[PDB]
Amino acid sequence: YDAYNLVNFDVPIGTKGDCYDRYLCRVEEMRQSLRIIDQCLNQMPAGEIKTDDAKVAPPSRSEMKTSMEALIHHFKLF
Amino acid sequence: PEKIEVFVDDIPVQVVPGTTVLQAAAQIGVEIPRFCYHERLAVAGNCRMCLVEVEKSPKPVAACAMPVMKGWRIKTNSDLTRKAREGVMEFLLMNHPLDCPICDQGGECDLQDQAMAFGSDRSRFTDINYTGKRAVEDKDIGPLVKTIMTRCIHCTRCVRFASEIAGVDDLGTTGRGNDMQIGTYVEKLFLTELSGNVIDLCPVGALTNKPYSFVARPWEIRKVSSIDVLDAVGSNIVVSTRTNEVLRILPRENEDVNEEWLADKSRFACDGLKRQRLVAPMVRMPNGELQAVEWEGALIAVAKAIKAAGGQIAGISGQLADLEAQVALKDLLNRLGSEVVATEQGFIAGGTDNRANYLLNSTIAGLEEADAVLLVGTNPRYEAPLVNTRLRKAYVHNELQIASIGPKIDLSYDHENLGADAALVKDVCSGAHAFSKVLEGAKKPAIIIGADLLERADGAAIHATVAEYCKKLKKPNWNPFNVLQTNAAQVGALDVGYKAGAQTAVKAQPKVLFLLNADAGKVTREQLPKDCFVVYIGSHGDNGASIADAVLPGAAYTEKQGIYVNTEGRPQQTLPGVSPPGMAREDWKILRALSEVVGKPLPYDNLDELRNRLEDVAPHLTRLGQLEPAGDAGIDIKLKELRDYFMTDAISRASPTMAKCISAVNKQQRENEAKQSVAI
Amino acid sequence: SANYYCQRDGRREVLPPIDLVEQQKQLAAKLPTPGKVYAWD
Amino acid sequence: PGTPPPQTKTKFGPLADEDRIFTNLYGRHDWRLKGALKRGDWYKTKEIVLKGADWIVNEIKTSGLRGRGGAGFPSGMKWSFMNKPGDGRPKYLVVNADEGEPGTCKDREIMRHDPHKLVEGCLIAGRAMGAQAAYIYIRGEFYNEASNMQLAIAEAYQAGLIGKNACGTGYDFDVFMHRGAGAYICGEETALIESLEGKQGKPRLKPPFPADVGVFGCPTTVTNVETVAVAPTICRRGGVWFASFGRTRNSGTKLFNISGHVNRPCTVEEEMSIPLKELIERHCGGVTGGWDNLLGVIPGGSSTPIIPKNVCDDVIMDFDGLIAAQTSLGTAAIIVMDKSTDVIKAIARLISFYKHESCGQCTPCREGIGWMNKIMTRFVKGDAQPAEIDMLWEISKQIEGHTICALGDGAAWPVQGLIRHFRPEIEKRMQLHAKRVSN
C-alpha cells in the first residue's frame, strides 16, 4: 500500500518470543525504517500532491478565488 | 387512453400518451436535472439540462418537452447524455458570479448541487484574466425581493409564474443574446400577494428573501413542519428554527391545501414574532397603568375577580386562537356556570348545527376543476390567495366564466361585474339573469360567499336563497355551496360550539370578559360596563390588551402545538418550533392552571386527554390531514387593496416588513400620481 | 482539451456487489484457494 | 404516387436563356403587372388552382424540389403535411423573406424585380395546402422591396387575381403583409411564427410542429421566397422539366450569388450540380489574381463551413456533393476569399455576427457563442495557447445539436471548418505573436 512495494527493506523476525526478542525487533524496525527513509528521499517524483478529482479533494486557493467550478466545489466540500 | 411501452434505462414502463420523457422517467425513479421546468408552470427550453439520448436519434432530446412515442429507448446514463449535461452546465457556469460565499441560496442552490451531481470538476474558462465575465445592473424591486441579476441564468421561471399564476404582467425578459436581462424595463415595484413564491421559484438565487437577508444558511436550519394561521387556506409550511429563533417560513408540499405556494402575509409574518411580544403577565394597578406581575399573583387576581363576578362571566374567542385554547376556554366557562361564548367574526343564526353552512364544501383541490364560479361579495386574492391561485389555474386551463357581485375588484383575471346591488343575487336565483344560465349549464359549478357578507344584517337570508339555488344545481361527488371565512379560528370555534358574534357577549353584560388572541377591536370599553375585568390571553396585544385589566401572555403559532381548522374543514396540527419568550405559556395550560386556582379544575392534565376530550366533543377534529365531506347546506368588501391586505392580523400589524411594504407601495402611488399630475 | 469528467469518473464507476452464486448461474446458461500460497513457515 | 425521375445526364454546365425561371431578374423589363403579363407570368393559373391540391403537390413531389432557404428538406413532402383535413382552424401559408444570412441576396432581387411570380406562387401553394391567407415577413431594411411588393399586391387585387374569387375559381386567398425590424433570428420558421403572433424572437421547440400548431394556434407552412416563386413554373412546365436539371436527388435551378474578392460580383441563376470552377470562370469574371490566388470559398452563408482551394477545385455544387465535401450547402451564397486577406478575422466577424444575432433563449447559444467570439478575438490577436484550438473544437461539439434552432449549429459549423482546414494559419499567427511578445 502507498509505494511500499517500490521500496526495499528487511523484516525483523524473532525466535524466542520474549520481551527481549520483541525489543530487538522494534529497534531493528527503527534500523530498517532508516533505509526506507533513505530510499524515499533518494527517489521522489515531481508532481501533484492531491488527486485531481475536485469533487473528492479541495481545489487550490487560486482556482477557488479565480474559477467558478472550484469555488462551488470548495463551498460544497467544506 | 391506452398506455404505450417505453424502455427507459433499459427498463420497461407503460405511460399514457402525451407525457414528457421526464415524467416517463420519473415514473420509475430516475430524475433528469432541470432549471426551466416546474411541475406547476409551463414547459420551456431556456436551459438545456434536459438533453437525454434516445436511441437511433442524431440529436439529444429535451426531456421536459419531449412527447414520447411508442418504443423509444431512453438512455439517461449514457456517455452522450453526460457529455451534453457537462457542456451545457459549464456554459451555464461560465458568466455566473463567484458570489457563493455571499449568496443566501448557497447550500440550497440547484446550480451547486447539480455541479456536484452532473457538472464537471474544473473550469475551462481561460478568459477571466482578460475581457472578463458578464455583469449586469441590479433591478429595482421593492422591500420583499433583493435583486442581483448577475447570478441569473435566464430560465424564465419568474416570468412564467408572473404571467400565468400571479397574473401580473410586469415581469419580462428584455434584449437579445448574452445581454438578455430578466427584469422590468423601468423601475417598478413588482407588487403581488404571491411575490414570495418567486424567491422559491428562482433556482439559483438572483431573487432573494429580503427579510431573510444574510441571516443563516440551509445546513444550519432545523426544519419543523407546521401550518400557517394568517390566511384562511391553512397552508402547510415549514419553519426555519435555529437556536431558539424563527428565521423564515417556507411552503410545504401538499396538493390539497397550498400546492407549494404561500401568500405574502403567510410568509413575511415571521418578523412580527419579535416585535410587541408579551413576555410577562401584566395586571392593571389602581394607579391606572399595567405592571408586570408574577404568575401566582396574576392567577389569584383573576380568580378573585371571578369569585367577585359570581357566575356572570363571558368569554370571546380570538382571530388567531388555537382550537385547544377555545376548548379550554369553553370548558372553563361551562364549569363556572356561564353558557355564553363568543367569536370576533359573526355568522348567521342557526348555522352551527350543520357543518356545511360554514365550510368551503367544494375542495380547494377540487376548485381547479370548476367550470363556472360566482363570487358573492368577496375578493379571494386578498382574503385567501391560494384559493385565487386555484381559480386562476381553473381560469387558464378550463373555459371558466366568473361573475362577481359587489364593488369593482381586480381578481388578476377578467370577470363580469354584475353590480354592487344586493338583490341582483336574487336574480341569480331567479334564472332570468344571464349568468344563471352559465351556472346551470356548467359541469362543476360553484358559488362562493364571503364571511363579511354573512356578518351583515341581511346575512342568513343571502345564506338561504343561494343554498336553495345550490339545491337546484348539484352534481354527484360535488358540493357547490362554498363559504370563505378569513379567520383561522372561526371554523374550529363553530365546530366546538361557539355562539358566533361579539355582540352576544357584549349584550350579556359580563363582569369578567375573557379574551383569547383577539385584536380585531370589535369590543371596547364603551360597550362594556363600568367595572369589567378584561383578561386578554394573547401573544402580541397591539389592540385588545390596552383595554385589558389582566394581560396574560401566550405562545404564537410557531411556539405551541395545537389544531387549526381551515375554511374547507380539514383539521391540521402545528408544531412548536421555538420556545415562548419570557415566561409565556400555552393558552390551554394557562386556562387549566386558572381553573385549578379558581377551584373547579378541568379533568385533562396533558395534551393527550385534551385530544381525548376533542374526540368526546367532535370525532372529525382529531383526524389531522383528513377531510370529511359534509352534506347539503341548509354589497361592500372590506378587503379590496393590497395595503388593506397587508395589516389584517396582529402579527402582521406588529411586523415592520408589512409597514415597509405599505410605505413602499404608497411611495410608488404618490410618485405615479405626481408624474401623472405634472402632465396636467 | 479532451478532458471529460465521465471518462475519469471515480465515484460513478462503483457497482453494487456481484452475487457469486448467481454469477455462475447466469454465466453458465487444482482446488480453489482464496489467494496465492505464502510460506510463513 | 410521385417520384423524381432519374437524370441520365453527364454534364450539367451549360444552359439556355429559355430555361430561366426568372426572366426579369436584372430588371431590364417592366416589373409591374403589364410586364408580367407580356412576360408569360399569371398564365393558366385558374386551371392549375382548379385541378386540385393533390395534383399540385404531386407535381412538386415529381419535380423533386428541395428546400432553398437553408435546409435539404424536400418541399413536396413538407407541403403534403397540410393535405390532412382541418379541425375547425384556418390554414396558413407563410413565406419567410428575411435572407439575413451574409452573402444571401437573391430573393431581395426577386422582390425588386419579379413580385407577381411570388404572388402567383403564394396563390398556387395556398391552393395546394388549403390555406386561405398568405403572410410575407419583410425586414425593415427592405423598405423599397416591401413597397414594390405592396404595389404588386394592390395591382393583383385590382386585377382580381387574388382575394375573393381568385382567377374566377371561387377560392378566397388574401395575401397580407408584415414588416419585421432587423432580426436575423427572425427567418427561422418558429421565430417568425412567434414574431407574427406579436411576441419577440425566440424559436419554439420541435414536436409541436408548424404544421401542427403554427401561427395564431392555426396550422401553417413556412416557405422560402424562391421555392414559392419557382412553384408556378414547376406547375406550368410539368414535373419532368424541373427534374431534367441537376442530379437525381438534387434536381432544380438555384440562384447563386458570388461575393467578395472577384472583379465582377455575381447574382446568376444557374443549374444545380455545376462545378464551382466552371461556374466562377464562365460568367461574371473570376477570382482576382487568378485561380491560383484563391484561398478559400464559403459555399453558403455564415451557417456553412469554409472549404480551401484544393478541396474546392473539384467540388460539384449540389447538396449531396457538398456534403461529400464536408460542408453544408444551405442557402446559396458563394463567398470567395483570396490569399491577400486573413481568414481568422473574417471567421471572427462571422462569430461576432452570430453573437449579435442570437436570441439568447438557449443557454449554450447564449453563453458559448460569446465564448467563441472571445476565443476568435484572441485568435485574431494571437494571444492564445495551441491547446485552445482543439478545446474550441470541443466548444463546437458542446453547441452543435444541443440547441433549439440551428443558429447554434450554424455558428459551430464554420469554426469546425476553420479548425479542420486552416489550423496551420492559426498556429503560424500564434507563433508569430509569441515570438513578438517574447522578444
Place this chain on the structure above:
Amino acid sequence: RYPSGEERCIACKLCEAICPAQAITIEAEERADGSRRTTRYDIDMTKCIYCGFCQEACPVDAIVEGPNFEFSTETHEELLYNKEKLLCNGDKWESEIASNLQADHLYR
C-alpha cells in the same frame, strides 16, 4: 481585516460547517450599508482542537491560525473567545500572520 480596514469575515459559515468540534457559533445580520458582516462570531477555544480546517475552508482570508500559543488563562470563561477578542487578536498579531500568509499561500 482588509488593508482598507473593513473586516474580512463575510459570515459565509463554512468554518462552522467544517469545524469538527463545532466550536464556532456565527449569527449574522445585514449591516446599515448592506454588508453581510457578522453580529456574533464566537470560538470556544476550550472546544477548539486547533486543527486548522477553518482557515482552509475560509474563502477570504478572514479566520486564521495566529502564531500565539502563550495564551494560558487563569479562569475557564476567559477562553470563550468573543468577536471582539478575535478582532483584537487580529489587530495585535497582524504582522506575523500576514508574513506567514505571504510565505505560505502558494503551498495551499
Place this chain on the structure above:
Amino acid sequence: DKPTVRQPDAVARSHLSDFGRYVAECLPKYVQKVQLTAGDELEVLIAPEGVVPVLQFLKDHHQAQFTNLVDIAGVDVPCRKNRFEVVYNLLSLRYNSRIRVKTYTDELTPLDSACEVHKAANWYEREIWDMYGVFFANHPDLRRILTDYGFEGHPQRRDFPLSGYVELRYDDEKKRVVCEPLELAQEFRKFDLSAPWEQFPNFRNANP
C-alpha cells in the same frame, strides 16, 4: 488512460470468486449469499445458527486457513427486522487473503460465541455486548468492558442519543461524584447535510 481511478486487482478477484463459490458449495446449510464487493473484498452472509460452524470451517480447512480473526464488528441498522448485524473479519496468513462473515441478530435473540474457535472473541464479543446488547451465549464471562459501571443502556445503537442521558458532577455535600440528568451549556447543532440530487445511478435499484 485514467490515473485518478483505482484499478482493481484481478488475481484477488478470480481467486476470491472461486473461493466464494467453493464456500457456497461446501456449506449450503448456513451460507445464504456470497458477494465480491468493489475493492476486492469477499463477504459471506450466514444464518445466525451458523456462526460457530462457519468460522470453525474457515479456521481449520486445508483450502482455507483463516486462522487470524482481526475484529468483530456490530452494525445497528434499525430499519430491518433483525436490526443488528455482526461482521467477523478473518485474515488467512497461509493463503494471504481476507474474508468477512456477516450475520443478522436481534437484541433478544442470542448469538453463538466464537470463543471456542478464536480466542480474540473472548473480548470483541464483549464489546458489541457493551455497545448493542447482542447477547453471546456460552461465553466465558460476558461483562461490561468499556462504559461506566453504573451505565444503563447501550450507546452505539442509533436510537441512543449522542450526548447520552445523564452527566456526572462532583457533589461536595455527598463528597462524591454524583449523577445528574443531562443539561448541555450549548446544544449539539444538527446539520442537515442531505443531498437532494442523487449522484450514483448504479445504486438506484440495488435494493431488490
Place this chain on the structure above:
Amino acid sequence: AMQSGTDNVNTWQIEFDNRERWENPLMGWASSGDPLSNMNVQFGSPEEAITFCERNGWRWYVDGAAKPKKERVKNYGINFAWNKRTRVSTK
C-alpha cells in the same frame, strides 16, 4: 422548496417533539436539557417505524401519509393554442 431535487424525501424518519431551548446566562448560546432533540431515525416504510416505536415502548403518532399519485399532463402545444385561455404571453 428552493430546490427541485427529491432524493432526501423518499426516506421516512422518526423524530421527537421539541422541548425548551433557552438563552445561556453567560454567552449567547442556546442550551437545551432535552437529550433527544437531535435524534432522527431513518426507516424505509411507515409500518417498520410503527413496529420500532411499539418495540421500544415509545408513544407514537404519524404526521401524515405520503401522496399516492398526482396525475399531471405537460403539453408544449398548449402554450400556443387557438380559442384557448392557456396561451402564454411570454417566452
Place this chain on the structure above:
Amino acid sequence: DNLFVHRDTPEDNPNIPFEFTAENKKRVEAILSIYPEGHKRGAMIPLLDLAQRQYGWLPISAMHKVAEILQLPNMRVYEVATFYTMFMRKPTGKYHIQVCTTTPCWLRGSDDILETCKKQLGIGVGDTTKDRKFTISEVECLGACVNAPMVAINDDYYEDLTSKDMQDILNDLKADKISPPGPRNGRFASEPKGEPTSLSEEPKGPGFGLQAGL
C-alpha cells in the same frame, strides 16, 4: 453603448405626450384590421415602427400608446421593442447611417468606408451629432451582398461605394440636397457588370413550355 433598462431622461420620460396623427389613425386601423380578431398583438411590430414613421425614434410614450391601443400591459411592448434592433430607444438624428461590418462586405473594404465616414463626421460609433443631423452605428448583414461596400441612409441603399464617392454623398447630404440610391459605378441593379452573360435573350411570352393535359 446601448442600455436595455430605461431611466428618467428629460428627453425620454413618459411625461412628454405622443399622439397618433389623424392621417396615421386610418393606417393604424388598417394594420389592426389585417390581423385576425383575438390576435391583434401581431399588429405590434408594424405599429411601433409606424411611430418611427412619425417621430423619428421610439420613446416610452410611443410604447405606452401601443400598449394602450392593443389593450395589453406595457411590459410586452417593452420587451418586444427592446429585443429588435431598429427600435432605437435613444435619440436618433435625421439621417441614420448604417455601415455593414460583416464578412462579405468586410472583404471589399468596409473598414475604409467606416474610417472615412468617422473622419467626415467626427463622431464615434453609436453616437449622434450635436445638431441631431447624422447618426452612425455598426450593423450586421442587410442583404444586397453583391454590392459589398454599401451603406444605408434613411432606409435607402447607397451601394458600390468608394471613400471619395461617400465623401461626395455626405457633402451632398450636408448641403440639404438629395442623393440618388443604387450602385455608384454606373451599374443599375444587381447584375454582372460590363457584359450581359445571362438573360441576354428576349424573354418568352405566354404559351411556351406548356405540358399536355393542363
